[PDB]
């Protein structure tokens, strides 16, 4: 009776463990970082494959930019075929895998609460198991913990593939966030500061372990992802060779990245299925890829040139006594609100213009502000002055405890929030900290 | 032919009337107000049970706060089992009952128009009857009439369970809104001003008449609802005993209420199914309830403390000649826009702080304003000065006919709207009315 | 084998061509413009009928105002019955036709990207062919081309039924946009400037060619559409007679139009199915139509009167030396934000008031502005001064290249956008251009 069913179940669990084990397929490039991450990469692939083979649903959340979309689509491309080979139902693909972008740089409560409500409905209504959750290009920080506390109330297992700094280290290779997730694939564990190995690179390698058969289809994705995130990693320069083999040079890759970020701005919370795959060149439909990229890119380029031409006259640029070129722009007063490009993207376009004119290695700091936020971008040259945005933000919060100062990101790129009524004081204090920097 | 079908239909209608009659199960507490409301309570339960037994769908709309969610979930908990016992289809639960929160304190046109479009699709596409509409913690005022005029164009029957003042009385126990709905359960009909018998209390009692079998599961809900709405009713202090029996003390209840209001802020238009039931302790899954409340509450507490610490230095507090402590805070300039806590919730947190420091019975008036709105909170002590927000709003509208003044709510708690360009004049006139109050 | 299937397919294509041919049913009114548009009208109907007969889905996009809704519903009313007669499945109606409003006056990227994602899902998941796309009261301009470039990457066929000026003419009867669509029905091709033959007029005639059987049901729709768009066309005054036959006088039509624009404001991205048909009087349910229009219209009228009374004292009206009456109103400072009526609608209500008081033929220019936009309305009297908004906008952009000036619309009605920080300069320059106009 129950003994028959239990003994058969126990054997099924064991055979699932065995079949889920990924092969050691190595990597597409040479990298000591990837080699050091191999055990966690193989564990991630094991967990994903096991969910697939047991008919458990998967939710894949990814950040909504080129690197994130590329990473998410890499994983989807490996997963879907496996789901289709083991499922009798042709609806299984659509039902047992969901990809959802996150516009925020962390797993927002609105996102996780939606994921929980949706998964609980499928559970109660159709008897589905609760899903494996895979978070990509997000998830590896302390800001993600609130979401994970909620998922753990449901016994949900969680895979993270990210390349942002977890920051709060509890040991040499363990961060605070790691206690709330089951496997965390992140270069920062094996080499602190190695942001340049991006989510799309990591995710493509994980995807190869999940399903070695999709290698040839996706091996160029890391070049697209690295272009999106502007990686200067030795791994990236190897990954580029796979794109070249398919006829994509470096300018092609840049156009593709710009197209993805533009289209994703407009489709918002939708996932771009039916479009993103064509842009990323993972279907055999070369003509549709060309029509999309050649149709869209000129439009994107023209918008950027138009907005730059109109906004640039309002950018104040001063060379400070220490040699720093400090640029400021009020993107509430002198930018089109709610339109492409967003303040973040606009600040990048302005910053790039100053880099093209004066050089990336010149010390350039671009501050783009609204009523209650500022986006900050620092050229590589700012490293010569030990510019660290996180340190400056902590300083500002301590000097102005009533101004609601918050944020940061990278030491060289990120954003600040503050109370609108204390903007003048916060930004003047920010400027004083920049003046005081020493070579 | 048609005579066979018609005679059988007529007998089915009569047996439906008979079976729908609820038993007189009394109440969970002693209350002359509930006793006086019994006929309408029994009518509400009759209408709901009848819809269920005829296979008619039900839409339940409720305000999106602790009292409203609690009330809605109380009713759902009684209804779903009955639907499942009479329906052959296991999809009947999901199809023939819908719970939809309303963030507005009235049945907004966007909500009712969506309800009508959705119900008309089910009608035309699947042949469903048009639903019984049950509105809870909303619906009992003149601001709800526009929605009801639209529903009545479709011959829809409407149950209202609310505890806000209908205001526009046409007789001793009948208000203007009552002409547009089929049964209105509201303590104000039998005892004017008795707001402290809240929707979750009322709805739990209605739920017991709908389905006496769920009594033990939901009899603690009124304690949660009353905590959310800060009821000081004699009924509330009895209802608390049912929560104590299940191990929930008064601090537990407060944490639960704070958790609901926090989570509901983030899930927005979603209904929280799969989560809210766990927080409200109506499943047997004690561990999940604990993980959610103990996981979430510290996070909620920390956000409130952080925001309070940052905002408090910007609150102006003056004791006026008449003894009133008048607090003002610009929540556009000195609060985080679009984040938890909302302006309404923030004003409450600031107001509570002033109450803790100076006492609830001291006369405290907290005015939190943005560009074009203000939230007003008056301590019990303000009653000694005959403070009435609705009267003050009428005065302001008459003195400043070009300023677009509108709103009110309770005599002691509510909000004003006005034209941004007349803010100074409106708020200075508001302050003069407060100065002129006499003990 | 493949020869059997291919020969049968070829014959099916030929019989589809034959059956899709519409009858020459003439028109409901006398019109040289319609006569000149007949070949394109018949082509539009051919393409729509062919899609229906082959079981291809149709997406109908329309602008979200009275004229657009009326046009969309006219076409839906003709299409649905044909779909139902040729489809075995009773779900075919719901699956093979979709009507989606567009709030923007062009085919926005957010709309088209959603259409592409949705159509690609149906394609991949259910094997549906890609749809015929029909755009109505939008689509006939250069601002629509980006959407069409994306649709053409998927080989999608596109029908446009619009009455806005394509502007960018490449020959006498061909505009730039025409290269991206398969048939464009627009009076401007055969008579430049003939905006007064509106989308609902055009669409009703197309609908008659699609399905002559629905003529009697929809022949009054053009009167509603023309009322919404305030057409003074000779065709309109004929179309009115069909409304009179059904008991709708000119005041009834105005109430209907005001009701549609009000309700559509609140249901937003939803399509109003189950409601709009009743308001438009195309069902046999006269009582529901009456309850909706008589229930809703007084509420609409009261809102307009209330807002007008409160806002009018803030309108500055000056008669300029040249005789022009120039009205200005700051609708950010002195109007209710986010509520009915929108800035566009509010400007119309203010403008109408000035027209009622001083006459339509008096030269009246109403400028309603926010932080970063302005809505402009010119009475017929402004024609005596050669007022052209598009020319003025070009002038402003050239004089103020750093102010981000954009927009236009009609020579007499439209809107400008600009950078908030250059508002003063843009509006003062706008006012100088108006001062300089000569009779
Ligand atoms: Mn990345
Ligand atoms: Mn309540
Ligand atoms: Mn139109």
Residues of A with CB under 8 A from a CB of C: 91, 94, 263, 266-268, 270-275, 278, 288, 291-292, 295-296, 299, 309-311, 313-314, 330, 332-337
CB-closest option in A94, A263, A333 to C125 = A94
CA of C296 vs chain B CAs: smallest distance (Å): 8
Nearest CA in chain C to A266: C110
Which one, of B92, B199, B86, lies nearest residue B138 by Cα?
B199
Question: What is the number of the ligand closest to the CA of C187?
Answer: 3
Whether C368 contacts C409, CB under 8 Å: no
CB-closest option in A263, A299, A337 to C113 = A263
Q: Classify burial at C3, counting beta carbons within 10 Å of its beta carbon; exposed 0-12, middle 13-18, buried 19 or more.
A: exposed
CB-closest option in C121, C154, C404 to A310 = C404
Q: Which helix (H) or strand (E) holds B72?
A: helix B66-86
Which one, of C235, C139, C131, C119, lies nearest residue C183 by Cα?
C139
- Chains contacting C (3+ CB pairs below 8 angstroms): A, B
The Å distance, Cα C321 to ligand 3 centre, comes to 35
Which tokens is B102 given? 């309303």
Whether B334 contacts B314, CB under 8 Å: yes
CATH number of the domain residue B101 falls in: 3.90.1640.30
The Å distance, Cα B68 to ligand 2 centre, comes to 6
Nearest CA in chain C to B371: C333
How far apart (Å, rounded) are the C-alpha atoms in residues A266 and C107?
Answer: 12
How far apart (Å, rounded) are the C-alpha atoms in residues A219 and A197?
Answer: 15
Strand partners, B58: B97, B132
How far apart (Å, rounded) are the C-alpha atoms in residues B14 and B16?
Answer: 5
Q: Classify burial at A431, counting beta carbons within 10 Å of its beta carbon; exposed 0-12, middle 13-18, buried 19 or more.
A: middle
The Å distance, Cα C140 to ligand 3 centre, comes to 12
Catalogue the long-range contacts made by B428-435 (C-beta closer than 8 Å, 24 or more residues apart).
B429/B396, B429/B399, B429/B400, B430/B367, B430/B374, B430/B392, B430/B396, B431/B326, B433/B392, B433/B395, B433/B396, B434/B320, B434/B324, B434/B326, B434/B365, B434/B387, B434/B392, B435/B320, B435/B321, B435/B322
How far apart (Å, rounded) are the C-alpha atoms in residues C280 and C283?
Answer: 8
Which one, of C423, C319, C301, lies nearest residue C363 by Cα?
C319
Whether A218 contacts A87, CB under 8 Å: no
The Å distance, Cα B201 to ligand 2 centre, comes to 9
Segments forming the whole domain that contains residue C60: 6-295
- Residue A278 to residue C117, Cβ atoms within 8 A: no
- Residue B274 to residue A152, Cβ atoms within 8 A: no
b/e per residue A133-165 (b: at least 16 CB within 10 A) = bbbbbbbbbebbbbbbbbbbbbebbbbbbbbbb
**CA distance to A83, A151, B381, C315, per residue, from A57 (Å):** 10, 15, 56, 60
Chain B residues within an 8 Å CB radius of C275: 113, 116-117, 120
How far apart (Å, rounded) are the C-alpha atoms in residues B72 and B78?
Answer: 10
b/e per residue A9-21 (b: at least 16 CB within 10 A) = eeeeeeeeeeebe
Please state the three-class secondary structure of B300-362 as a single string.
Answer: HHHHHHHHHHHHHHHCEEEECCCCCEEEEEECCCCCCCCCCCCHHHHHHHHHHHHHHHHCCCC
The Å distance, Cα B307 to ligand 2 centre, comes to 25
Q: What dihedral angle (degrees, nearest 10) is formed by the CA atoms of B392, B396, B398, B404?
A: -130
**CA distance to A115, A398, C229, per residue, from C253 (Å):** 47, 65, 12
Whether C109 contacts A259, CB under 8 Å: no
Which one, of C388, C365, C386, C369, lies nearest residue C377 by Cα?
C365
Chain A residues within an 8 Å CB radius of C417: 336
Which one, of B278, B285, B296, lies nearest residue B77 by Cα?
B278
Question: In B268-285, which residue ranges form alpha helices assigned H by DSSP?
Answer: 276-279
> Distance between the two ends of chain A, CA-based, in angstroms?
78
> Distance between the two ends of chain B, CA-based, in angstroms?
78
Which tokens is B145 given? 């009439």
Which one, of A337, A372, A330, A415, lies nearest residue B337 by Cα?
A372
* Chain A, chain B: beta-carbon pairs less than 8 Å apart: 79
Whether the CA torsion B83, B88, B89, B95 is positive or negative: it is negative
Whether the CA torsion B244, B246, B252, B254 is positive or negative: it is negative
Interface test with A, best of C103, C108, C115, C117 (most A CBs within 10 A): C117
How far apart (Å, rounded) are the C-alpha atoms in residues A159 and A140?
Answer: 10
The Å distance, Cα B75 to ligand 2 centre, comes to 15
Strand partners, C97: C58
Across the beta sheet with B364-369, the strand order is B316-319, B325-330, B364-369, B373-378, B413-417, B406-409
Binding residues of A for Mn(2+): 67, 137, 163, 229
How far apart (Å, rounded) are the C-alpha atoms in residues A153 and B295?
Answer: 8
Chain A residues within an 8 Å CB radius of B314: 402, 421
For A323, phi then psi, to 5°, come to: 100, -5
Instruction: Check whether C352 is labelled as a binding-site residue.
Output: no
- Residue C422 to residue A272, Cβ atoms within 8 A: no
Question: What is the number of the ligand closest to the CA of A67?
Answer: 1
A393 Rama class: left (phi>0) / alpha (psi -120 to 50) / beta: alpha
How far apart (Å, rounded) are the C-alpha atoms in residues C125 and C122?
Answer: 5
Q: What number of CA atoms fall less than 13 Å from residue B308's CA on the CB side?
A: 15
Instruction: Check whether C67 is labelled as a binding-site residue.
Output: yes
Chain A residues within an 8 Å CB radius of C123: 274
CB atoms within 10 A of CB C275: 23
Q: Classify burial at A398, counting beta carbons within 10 Å of its beta carbon; exposed 0-12, middle 13-18, buried 19 or more.
A: exposed
Give the pairing of strands C364-369 and C325-330: parallel
CB-closest option in B273, B299, B333 to A421 = B333
Chain A residues within an 8 Å CB radius of B103: none
- Residue B333 to residue A419, Cβ atoms within 8 A: yes
CB-closest option in A266, A274, A291 to C121 = A274
Q: Which helix (H) or strand (E) holds B292?
A: helix B286-311
**CA distance to A167, A413, A429, B166, B234, per residue, from A390 (Å):** 11, 10, 14, 54, 54
Chain A residues within an 8 Å CB radius of B267: 109-110, 113-114, 117
């Amino acid at each position: 009776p129950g003994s028959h069913m239990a003994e058969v179940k126990r054997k099924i669990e064991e055979e699932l463990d065995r079949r889920a084990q990924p092969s050691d397929v190595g990597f597409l490039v040479k990298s000591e970082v990837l080699e050091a991450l191999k055990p966690k990469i193989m564990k991630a692939a094991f967990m994903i494959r096991r969910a697939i083979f047991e008919g458990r649903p998967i939710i894949l959340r990814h950040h909504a930019d080129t690197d994130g979309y590329t990473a998410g689509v890499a994983l989807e491309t490996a997963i879907i075929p496996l789901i289709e080979k083991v499922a009798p139902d042709p609806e299984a693909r659509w039902h047992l895998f969901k990809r959802r972008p996150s516009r925020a740089p962390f797993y927002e409560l609105e996102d996780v609460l939606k994921d929980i409500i949706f998964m609980m409905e499928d559970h109660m209504r159709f008897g589905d198991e609760l899903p494996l959750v895979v978070i990509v290009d997000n998830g590896g920080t302390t800001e993600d913990i609130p979401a994970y506390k909620r998922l753990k109330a449901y016994g949900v297992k969680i895979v993270v593939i990210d390349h942002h700094d977890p920051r709060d280290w509890i040991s040499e290779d363990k961060a605070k966030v790691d206690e709330y997730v089951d496997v965390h694939v992140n270069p920062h564990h094996v080499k602190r500061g190695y942001y340049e190995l991006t989510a799309g690179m990591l995710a493509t390698e994980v995807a190869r372990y999940i399903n070695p058969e999709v290698e040839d289809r996706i091996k160029h994705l890391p070049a697209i992802a690295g272009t999106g995130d502007r990686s200067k990693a030795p791994e990236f320069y190897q990954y580029l060779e796979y794109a070249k083999e398919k006829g994509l040079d470096e300018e092609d890759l840049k156009k593709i990245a710009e197209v993805i970020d533009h289209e994703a701005f407009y489709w918002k919370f939708m996932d771009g299925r039916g479009i993103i795959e064509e842009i990323l060149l993972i279907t055999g439909n070369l003509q549709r890829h060309r029509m999309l990229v050649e149709g869209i890119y000129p439009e994107v380029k023209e918008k950027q040139e138009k907005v730059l031409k109109a906004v640039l006259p309002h950018v104040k640029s001063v060379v400070l006594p220490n040699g720093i070129r400090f640029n400021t722009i009020d993107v509430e007063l002198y930018a089109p609100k709610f339109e492409y490009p967003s303040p973040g993207k606009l600040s990048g376009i302005i910053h790039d213009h100053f880099k093209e004119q004066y050089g990336e290695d010149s010390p350039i700091l671009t501050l783009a502000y609204g009523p209650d936020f500022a986006v900050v971008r620092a050229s590589d040259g700012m490293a010569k002055y030990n510019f660290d945005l996180n340190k400056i933000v902590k300083i500002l919060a301590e000097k102005l405890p009533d101004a609601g100062v918050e944020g940061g990101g990278h030491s060289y790129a990120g954003s600040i929030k503050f109370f609108e009524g204390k903007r003048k004081e916060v930004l003047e204090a920010f400027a004083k900290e920049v003046l005081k920097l020493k070579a």
